[PDB]
C-alpha cells in the first residue's frame, strides 16, 4: 500500500516465479481461445 514493506530475496524470487507462471498460463489460455476462434472461422467457411 503506502508504506513499502521489505521482502526477502527468496520471497521476491518466489513471487516472480508465481507471476511468470500466471502469465504463461494466461498465454496458453489465449492460445487455446485463438484455436477456438480459428476453428469457428474454419467450420463457418466449411
Amino acid at each position: 500500500e503506502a508504506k513499502p514493506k521489505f521482502l526477502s530475496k527468496a520471497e521476491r524470487e518466489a513471487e516472480a516465479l508465481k507471476r511468470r507462471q500466471q502469465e504463461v498460463e494466461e498465454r496458453q489460455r489465449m492460445l487455446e481461445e485463438e484455436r477456438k476462434k480459428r476453428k469457428q472461422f474454419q467450420d463457418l467457411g466449411r
Binding site: P4, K5, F6, L7, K9, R12
Partner: protein
C-alpha cells in the same frame, strides 16, 4: 526493515517515484519501488559485511 524506513527519508526516495529510469527502475509501482529499495540495501549490506 529499519534500513528501508531510513531510505524513505532521503531525497533519493522522492525521485525514485518521479524519475525511476534514472535509477535503473522499471516502474513507479509500489512493488517495483520496494523491490529496488530492498535490492540496493541488500547489496550495500553484503558488500559492507
Amino acid at each position: 526493515q529499519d534500513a528501508v524506513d531510513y531510505l524513505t527519508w532521503t531525497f533519493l526516495y522522492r525521485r525514485m517515484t518521479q524519475n525511476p529510469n534514472y535509477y535503473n527502475l522499471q516502474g513507479i509501482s509500489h512493488r517495483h519501488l520496494s523491490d529496488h529499495l530492498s535490492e540496493l540495501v541488500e547489496q550495500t549490506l553484503s558488500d559492507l559485511e
